Amino acid sequence: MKVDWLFKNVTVIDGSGGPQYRADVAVKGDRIMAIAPALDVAAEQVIDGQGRVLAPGFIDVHTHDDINVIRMPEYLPKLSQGVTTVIVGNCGISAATATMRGEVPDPMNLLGEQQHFIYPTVEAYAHAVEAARPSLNVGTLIGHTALRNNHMDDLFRPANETEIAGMRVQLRDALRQGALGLSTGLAYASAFQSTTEEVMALAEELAAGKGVYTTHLRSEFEPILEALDEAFRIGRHGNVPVVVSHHKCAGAKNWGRTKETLAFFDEMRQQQDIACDCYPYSASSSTLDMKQVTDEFDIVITWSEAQPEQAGKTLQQIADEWQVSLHDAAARLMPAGAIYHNMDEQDVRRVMRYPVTMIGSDGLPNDPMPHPRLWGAFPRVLGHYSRDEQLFPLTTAVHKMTGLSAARFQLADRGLVKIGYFADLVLFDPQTVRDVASFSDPKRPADGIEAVMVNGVMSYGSDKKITGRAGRFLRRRMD
Numbered sequence: 467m468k469v470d471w472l473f474k475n476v477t478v479i480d481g482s483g484g485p486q487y488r489a490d491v492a493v494k495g496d497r498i499m500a501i502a503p504a505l506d507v508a509a510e511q512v513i514d515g516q517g518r519v520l521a522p523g524f525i526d527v528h529t530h531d532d533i534n535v536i537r538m539p540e541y542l543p544k545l546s547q548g549v550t551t552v553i554v555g556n557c558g559i560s561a562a563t564a565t566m567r568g569e570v571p572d573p574m575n576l577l578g579e580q581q582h583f584i585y586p587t588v589e590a591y592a593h594a595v596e597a598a599r600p601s602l603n604v605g606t607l608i609g610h611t612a613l614r615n616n617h618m619d620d621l622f623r624p625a626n627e628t629e630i631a632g633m634r635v636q637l638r639d640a641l642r643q644g645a646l647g648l649s650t651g652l653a654y655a656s657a658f659q660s661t662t663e664e665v666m667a668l669a670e671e672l673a674a675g676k677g678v679y680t681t682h683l684r685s686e687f688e689p690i691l692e693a694l695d696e697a698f699r700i701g702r703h704g705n706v707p708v709v710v711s712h713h714k715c716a717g718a719k720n721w722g723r724t725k726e727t728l729a730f731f732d733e734m735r736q737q738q739d740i741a742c743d744c745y746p747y748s749a750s751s752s753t754l755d756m757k758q759v760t761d762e763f764d765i766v767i768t769w770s771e772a773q774p775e776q777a778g779k780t781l782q783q784i785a786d787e788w789q790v791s792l793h794d795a796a797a798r799l800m801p802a803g804a805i806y807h808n809m810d811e812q813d814v815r816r817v818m819r820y821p822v823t824m825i826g827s828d829g830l831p832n833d834p835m836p837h838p839r840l841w842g843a844f845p846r847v848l849g850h851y852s853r854d855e856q857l858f859p860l861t862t863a864v865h866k867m868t869g870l871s872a873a874r875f876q877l878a879d880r881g882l883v884k885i886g887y888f889a890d891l892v893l894f895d896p897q898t899v900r901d902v903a904s905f906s907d908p909k910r911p912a913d914g915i916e917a918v919m920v921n922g923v924m925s926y927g928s929d930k931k932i933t934g935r936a937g938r939f940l941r942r943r944m945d
């Protein structure tokens with residue numbers, strides 16, 4: 467057969483976590499059409515893949531790209547990492563189905579401003595995505611807080627029955643239109659007052675395979691076990707799978723406690739379906755907030771409106787230079803952004819190695835000085851953690867950003883190098899793949915990503931130029 471693309475002599479890491487092997491892989495249209503020890507076929511395009519890995523396109527299961535992927539369809543921060551699908555609508559906030567009857571509630575402002583929320587149904591969001599012709603695929607969760615906001619006159623209280631019944635119906639229609647499930651962000655003020663019962667009511671719409679429950683826990687600090695217990699209870703009430711978003715033990719007092727949380731996962735996964743994702747860094751990044759100020763670890767200023775030349779220094783250094791207290795120095799920097807070294811590297815590694823842990827970047831594309839995970843999460847797992855630190859073999863590393871993720875979120879025919887699946891594919895050099903993005907210089911494309919293919923269209927390459935606009939809106943696999 468004449469094929470469109472032939473990948474010769476590649477090490478296939480097929481996304482299942484199984485062993486690797488060498489083969490030729492052929493693509494025709496948007497489908498992987500053949501895999502064999504060799505394929506003696508004429509192709510429009512041939513790539514000698516010797517010495518490279520052919521993997522499924524990476525699936526970023528934790529993004530806030532809802533609106534930005536439409537505004538910047540040639541979505542370089544993710545595509546240059548090898549990402550071919552983004553899952554949007556996380557932590558309780560989604561553009562899809564969100565109507566703004568007034569002020570935009572925190573943290574929906576991470577996605578955009580009031581005027582950008584013009585997608586009152588999943589259907590409307592889907593067609594807006596495809597009108598933008600993005601370079602990677604998009605699927606969406608439905609944001610719990612966005613639903614709250616559609617139905618409640620004020621967010622800072624438990625919802626009443628009538629409000630919750632409305633939310634159930636709106637979520638049902640969204641899942642019918644292909645939404646992948648429901649996200650919560652229960653630690654945020656705008657959802658913190660919700661009861662477990664309210665969330666249970668919405669999670670019930672997910673039963674019988676209609677989606678996954680993903681959750682930013684009600685707390686990622688001291689009471690994290692209690693918050694984990696609530697998530698699992700919600701999962702058991704609805705009989706729905708749970709994904710714990712960006713699982714971490716934050717704060718010096720909780721360092722080492724992933725030994726406890728993952729033990730809780732072990733125990734509870736014996737009776738229900740639970741997974742999680744994490745980003746592969748032990749520092750967080752946010753606005754500089756007085757309540758976060760501490761001398762327990764480095765706080766590094768990323769930018770400061772009040773004193774822009776202090777960026778790059780630690781809060782302690784700045785306080786010492788100014789001869790003031792940490793809090794006084796904080797006040798004099800604000801408004802500012804900061805990196806918080808408030809996670810323990812061993813915790814992050816324990817969570818990354820946990821068998822059901824997926825990789826998500828949790829990138830924030832509207833941040834003025836972005837955390838480098840926005841540009842580096844996936845090559846950082848393949849290069850720094852798998853190759854250099856040997857946290858897991860490369861087949862496992864790829865598994866955690868492809869087949870595992872596609873299965874958990876019910877993406878049809880994606881996440882595996884498999885005959886008959888869609889041709890979302892990454893060709894990368896395993897010896898040189900690496901996250902170039904750094905905290906001081908975050909907006910930098912990875913190295914070692916040699917070709918990225920989306921729905922059979924070659925879209926990105928070693929010259930760092932985008933050449934395809936073949937992304938689609940992905941609907942949940944229906945039964």
Ligand code: NI
Nearest residue numbers: 557651682711
């Ligand atoms: Ni979150």
Ligand code: NI
Nearest residue numbers: 528556557828
């Ligand atoms: Ni998030």
